């Protein structure tokens, strides 16, 4: 399944995923393509931040859906 | 205690004593116990900041895992700063959390805390109220921080425009310290400060 992830630059990252993939797996893929650490990544779909342990299928995320990536540099 | 922890602290303590920064009265450190696990630090407020002319004492606790974990440092002297709790003195600084490295020392911690005073990070706050004021109203934050440097840290000058508001509430019968804290935390709104004091 192909999905898109949009950055605030406008840059679109194209990923290949499965509905069974968790959100942390998606972040791991984003690290592999873009060198961005997963603890800096917030993924957003349908106006809501997605949580790490749930799957794409849990959120009704489908072929050619667009997620949003906002980088929040940790901040403890 | 572990020999590496004891040797490192003994070395780092003398380095602070012998430092150029200690000869300029910028930093110092003293022992509290006989075992080197508790120390008291002092740093001068940096020049061209609201903290100038203030002296800030620090509680420093050395973990059994030193030098591979950071010291626990707390401001004893009250301070108005986005990254330091105005209530507890707890510090939000990356080197005291997740970016400690074993090569760091008592000296570099004390110096880093001075650099923090000169350059706050209000987007990673310890004190949300101080941080909100820092960003929303820079001039008020600066005058409030200078007032706190004078009141708590022995800084010579503070600002006459706050004197008036402090004296009004002090004349209502409230304690001057409580008044200072209420007015600072309410961004100098007399009415909400009075409400706070009345609870």
Numbering used by the authors:
A (entry chain B): 1 to 76
B (entry chain A): 1 to 199
What does the paper say about this structure?
The ubiquitin conjugating enzyme Ube2K (also known as E2-25 K and Huntington Interacting Protein 2) is a Class II E2 that preferentially synthesizes Lys48-linked chains on monoubiquitylated substrates, or forms Lys48-linked diubiquitin in the absence of an E321. Uniquely amongst E2 proteins, Ube2K has a C-terminal ubiquitin associating domain (UBA). The UBA domain is not required for the synthesis of Lys48-linked chains, but may act to tether the E2 to ubiquitylated substrates thereby enhancing elongation of Lys48 chains. Here we show that Ube2K is a monomeric E2 and the position of UbD is similar to that observed elsewhere, while several key contacts between Ube2K and UbA orient the incoming ubiquitin.
In order to ensure the formation of a stable isopeptide bond between Ube2K and ubiquitin, we mutated the active site Cys92 to Lys. To prevent the undesirable conjugation of ubiquitin to Lys97, which is in close proximity to the active site, Lys97 was mutated to Arg. The isopeptide-linked Ube2K~Ub conjugate crystallized in spacegroup C2 with one molecule per asymmetric unit and data were processed to 2.1 Å. In the structure, two conjugates associate with the ubiquitin moiety of one conjugate packed against the MGF-motif27 of the UBA domain of the neighbouring molecule. In this conformation ubiquitin is locked in an open position and there are minimal contacts between Ube2K and its conjugated ubiquitin. An overlay of the UBC domain of the Ube2K conjugate structure with that of the previously reported Ube2K UBA:ubiquitin complex has an RMSD of 0.48 Å. In contrast, the position of both the UBA domain and ubiquitin in our structure is shifted. When the two UBA domains are aligned, even though the same residues mediate contacts between ubiquitin and the UBA domain, ubiquitin is rotated relative to the standard ubiquitin:UBA interaction. Even though crystal contacts may help stabilize this conformation, this structure suggests a more plastic Ub-UBA interface than previously reported. The apparent dimeric configuration of Ube2K~Ub did not suggest a catalytically competent complex had formed, as Lys48 of the UBA-associated ubiquitin is ~30 Å from the active site of its partner.
